[PDB]
Nucleic acid binder design. Structure first.
Ligand SMILES: [Mg+2]
Ligand SMILES: [Mg+2]
Ligand SMILES: [Mg+2]
Ligand SMILES: [Mg+2]
Ligand SMILES: [Mg+2]
Ligand SMILES: [Mg+2]
Ligand SMILES: [Mg+2]
Ligand SMILES: [Mg+2]
Ligand SMILES: [Mg+2]
Lengths: 25, 191, 171, 234
RNA sequence: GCAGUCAAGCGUUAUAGCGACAUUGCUUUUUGAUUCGAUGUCGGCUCUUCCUAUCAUACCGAAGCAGAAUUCGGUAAGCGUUGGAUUGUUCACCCACUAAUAGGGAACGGCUGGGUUUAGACCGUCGUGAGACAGGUUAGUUUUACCCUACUGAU
RNA sequence: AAGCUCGUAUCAGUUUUAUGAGUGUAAGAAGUCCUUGUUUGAACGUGGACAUUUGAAUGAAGAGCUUUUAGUGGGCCAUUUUUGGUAAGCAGAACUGGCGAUGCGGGAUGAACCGAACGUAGAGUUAAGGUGCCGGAAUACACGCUCAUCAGACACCACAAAAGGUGUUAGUUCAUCUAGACAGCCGGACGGUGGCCAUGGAAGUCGGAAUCCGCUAAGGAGUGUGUAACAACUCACCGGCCGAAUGAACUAGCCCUGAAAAUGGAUGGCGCUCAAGCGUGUUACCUAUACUCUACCGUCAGGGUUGAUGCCCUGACGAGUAGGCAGG
RNA sequence: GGCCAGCAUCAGUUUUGGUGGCAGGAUAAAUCCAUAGGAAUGUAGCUUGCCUCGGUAAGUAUUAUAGCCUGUGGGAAUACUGCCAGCUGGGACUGAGGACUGCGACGUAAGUCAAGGAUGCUGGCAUAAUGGUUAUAUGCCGCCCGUCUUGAAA
């Protein structure tokens, strides 16, 4: 029922994509 | 849920005048006048024109809005009673003992007298409520007609007449004698 | 009490050959800064593996409402503790301030869900920018055009024991 | 709490979904390319054997029924969404129970068939009464005096509550037979019939009305224009 | 009761472990055939009130309830709920009358028979004995009220 | 209770540091440095020397050694560890609290519950508990929930199956929806086919097994009523009219059931229903032998003093059974 | 001079008002002003449908004959929290001590003072008036002692 679910999902996907490489290099 | 405002509409035909003051409703039509006391419910009546009347509840709950719809139905029934009337047809049947139904006057009170129900010596008496007329039918066998402007009064009189002739201590699958409401409708039959 | 919103920024204590630890920021609703720092350390230990004796508080700053005199619709995403586990809940509150919306939510939890301040977690408070995104009827009924309603059966408060006139509830 | 409870039945047939409408949509839009003449037909209150007879007599063509909105969406509601040129007039000519007839047969042959085709049908409510019906006095028979009473089997006793309550006919049970005290006129010839009168006529089995398929118009592929037929549109 | 089966759930990411409703087997097998150790407290008479978990009486609902009679159930305690036989035992059982012969509490956390019955006596079992008992039988004095209160009547 | 000594002396139901275990030990005169004697190393020593920056924190004015004698002893309850469990209660160990010997405020009333320990008074402020009336103190303010044909104002255990309810409120997850949502009305609901066996009869609907194909928008070799069999109605499903939300399964709060006897009686009573009930928030207010200030009594302690076991100055303390000492 | 009071100026403790000056935060956020965009719970205007002589139903139109929201910039005020060896009003309880000594303050000065504990002015009564004793009334509290037993109204 939260309205900005799409924004939350986009933010968490961006965080995952950043943290994938923040530890590698 | 506490809805802010819930309303219902009541449609008034051309020949009917309805006056409301402190939830005392008076309905006047071609067939006469009817009065209702609705002071046990907190509703607000509003007039927008001579053909439409709104009834509203402000900041109410489920029971309150249920009472609102009930009020609308009661006022509609009053309008229907003053503009068309109500008419209940009942039939009385028997297996062996002919049921005798008459209209009698006990100090001018208009009782309905029932004799010989299942051969009983007891004489059953049902008073006739004010505003309803009793007529034994024409070219229909063993039929009574109750007419009037108040559907509550007509239906209650019919129910009392039906319940005065209950069969006691017998199998109702076998013993079928009684007085039963056969039809409900309106007095006017233009169409 | 009357809630205030704070930002708390903390970090681990710097160590040898591992300097400048990463900073972490939380937005905390609390009545005062002592409670705010306690909530910050509690949530930091619950989420990260950071302890109060191993970390420090870098900053704590009160966050005022940007437009406190503008009526807003708020969606509040919260979670609470239970024996089955952590359950989500979404509520909608019409108010002019984030802190007052949070206070209304806490009172509603205390009334209906029989919940407590330490057991209720404020996860997100977001202003609903568009009126079409409001999805609760008890809030949508106040968004209607040209909204009017009376206040029937007004009860006045008497300062005297005896009144010489029968009262009226008109308005 | 305090809600209505839905009745639970254990049957063998489950409900249809959006996939059925999608299949009808695709079939209509394929038949539009496959065939040449697209007729719009009105078939209100049609019996399924009669519809199957029409389908059998039109072997090689296609008759597609279904939801009117689905058929109109397949044909294209407006000019910017129509599947073919000038198809929006044919789409907006749909009304009620609409059937789409895709064919390559001659226009004159189609018109001749739909002008010469008619079948006996039960009298419907709000339609003109094709005859005058009066149940005769005495024992009520299954045909109600249309055929000789000696030939006719008497009406079964189980229908007496239906006749007394639903049909509002004053009936009695004498020795297991339905009886009336006087003849009962139900419908008069040349008079609008309501649901109860239609039910009584259907129960006694009188079928004097006629069913004629109505043809609104048709659309031609090559000319790309709609021509009004005005067949059985009285 | 024990042993097992199933699975609405609970649990889990390791088809581990709990587990409602149901259900199987033994007790208990097909033709309506034919008394076995209460180890310590019992029953009466007179008379009052209370409970309902209702036997009868009142009113209802259901049932292959035709009628008559009966069965199950609901409200209901207003009103009733007996006379006798039997002690080689009755922690009961028969006969009859009756509308019916319902269950229980206020004890069991005044007269009166069983019973705590002490001194007399006999039989049985045990003990070398004084004696004790697995036991059985019989005989055996406790005696207010004018006090306060309550209750009934009276100044 | 008597002596002797010492008194930066002796320490501590505490923490810290180092080191163990999954609470123990240690933290300086019962030291340290050089010098090389005892049986090239451990372990014992010759002579000289370093202090009030003598070896963490906090607190403490009395500590140590000899003599010397009155009353007492198998108690209850509770918390925390641990071992075995029972229909259920629980039973055996270790440690620590409360009570006996103890008044005071509150919990209506009370052996172990909450607060607080007690000279005689005055003033002020509070604890715990409360502020509709009994009754001192807001029928305060604010946001929600609840209606009980004997609600609740309770101990947080049991009745209790997180079971039943068409009471009410708030949530969660799935689905349907202007190529049309929930209801309603009307129409269709077909053909092979009266599918096979069985039956006196049995055609979707007493039964036993197949449960197919076609045509469809859709229609079961049929969900029920009905017939001796058919007939007829129905629903499974589809469509027409209507036009905007709706359905299902769970979770939580409050409410009702979730078993009760027996003289007439109990949230303490009255009574209370947008409470005087339940959850929560903000303030104000009431009052203990408690806290703060003052006076007075006594005791103890530290100082001064050419009726001296008197006088003067200052400070802190004051519960008590057996028992002890002292003054009357 | 014995009894009971009233007022004034002080001291100790305490309670309850009014008013002033400062300091911090996003050097409060806001309101307000300027500027640039944006939409609807769509303001003016336009269109058509047909409505009681134009009030409406639905399309368009982003400030027009109302307004609103967001970003940026500017100058303030106020709230909240805290500090003052700032000022000042009302009320209650207390007055221990008894030559001087001390520490201070205002003062050039002699002196004065709220600075090691209350003085000054005034009234009435002068006796059952205050007070004591005794008999009772009212509000609240209070179970019958000793002994023996955990423990006792039980
Ligand atoms: Mg009963
Ligand atoms: Mg003897
Ligand atoms: Mg008071
Ligand atoms: Mg019980
Ligand atoms: Mg109270
Ligand atoms: Mg409250
Ligand atoms: Mg003063
Ligand atoms: Mg006096
Ligand atoms: Mg007392």
């Amino acid at each position: 029922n939260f309205p900005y679910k799409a924004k939350i999902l986009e933010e968490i996907e961006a965080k995952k994509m950043k943290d994938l490489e923040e530890r590698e290099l | 849920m506490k809805y802010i405002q819930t309303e219902q509409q009541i449609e008034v035909p051309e020949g009917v005048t309805v006056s409301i003051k402190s939830r005392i409703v008076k309905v006047v039509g071609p067939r006469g006048t009817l009065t209702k006391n609705l002071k046990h419910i907190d509703v607000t009546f509003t007039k927008v024109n001579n053909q439409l009347i709104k009834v509203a509840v402000h900041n109410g709950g489920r029971k309150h809005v249920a009472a609102l719809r009930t009020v609308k139905s009661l006022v509609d029934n009053m309008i229907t009673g003053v503009t068309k009337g109500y008419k209940y047809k009942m039939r009385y049947v028997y297996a062996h003992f002919p049921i005798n139904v008459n209209i009698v006057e006990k100090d001018g009170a208009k009782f309905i007298e029932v004799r010989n129900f299942l051969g009983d010596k007891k004489i059953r008496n049902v008073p006739v409520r004010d505003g309803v007329t009793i007529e034994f039918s024409t070219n229909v066998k063993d039929e009574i007609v109750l007419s009037g402007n108040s559907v509550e009064d007509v239906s209650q009189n019919a129910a009392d007449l039906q319940q005065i002739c209950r069969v006691r201590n017998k199998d109702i699958r076998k013993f079928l004698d009684g007085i039963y409401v056969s039809h409900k409708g309106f007095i006017t039959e233009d169409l | 009490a009357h809630f205030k919103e704070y930002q708390v920024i903390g970090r681990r204590l710097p160590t040898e050959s591992v300097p400048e630890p990463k900073l972490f920021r939380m937005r905390i609703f609390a009545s005062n800064e002592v409670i705010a720092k306690s909530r910050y350390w509690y949530f930091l230990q619950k989420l990260h593996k950071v302890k109060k004796a191993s970390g420090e508080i870098v900053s704590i700053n009160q966050i005022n409402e940007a437009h406190p005199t503008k009526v807003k619709n708020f969606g509040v995403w919260v979670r609470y503790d239970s024996r089955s586990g952590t359950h989500n809940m979404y509520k909608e509150i019409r108010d002019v301030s984030r802190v007052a919306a949070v206070e209304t939510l806490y009172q509603d939890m205390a009334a209906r869900h029989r919940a407590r301040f330490r057991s209720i977690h404020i996860l997100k408070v977001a202003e609903i920018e568009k009126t079409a995104d409001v999805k609760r009827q008890y809030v949508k009924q106040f968004l209607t055009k040209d909204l009017k309603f009376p206040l029937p059966h007004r009860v006045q408060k008497s300062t005297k024991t005896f009144s010489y006139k029968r009262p009226s509830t008109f308005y | 709490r305090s809600k209505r409870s839905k009745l639970v039945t254990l049957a063998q047939t489950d409900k249809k979904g959006r996939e059925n409408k999608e299949r009808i949509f695709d079939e209509v839009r394929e038949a539009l390319d496959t065939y040449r003449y697209v007729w719009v037909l009105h078939l209100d209150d049609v019996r399924t054997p009669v519809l199957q007879e029409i389908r059998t007599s039109w072997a090689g063509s296609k008759l597609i029924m279904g939801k009117r909105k689905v058929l109109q969406k397949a044909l294209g509601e407006k000019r910017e969404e129509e599947y073919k040129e000038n198809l929006y007039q044919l789409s907006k000519l749909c009304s009620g129970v609409t059937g789409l007839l895709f064919t390559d047969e001659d226009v004159n042959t189609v018109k001749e068939y739909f002008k010469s085709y008619v079948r006996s049908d039960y009298s419907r409510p709000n339609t003109k009464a094709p005859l005058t019906f009066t149940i005769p006095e005495g024992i009520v028979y299954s045909r109600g005096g249309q055929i000789p009473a000696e030939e006719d089997v008497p009406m079964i006793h189980s229908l007496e509550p239906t006749m007394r309550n639903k049909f509002e006919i004053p009936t009695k049970i004498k020795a297991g037979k339905i009886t009336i005290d006087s003849p009962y006129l139900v419908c008069t010839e040349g008079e609008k019939l309501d649901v109860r009168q239609a039910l009584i006529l259907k129960q006694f089995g009188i079928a004097a009305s006629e069913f004629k398929v109505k043809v609104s118009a048709y659309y031609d592929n090559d000319s790309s224009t709609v021509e009004s037929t005005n067949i059985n549109m009285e």
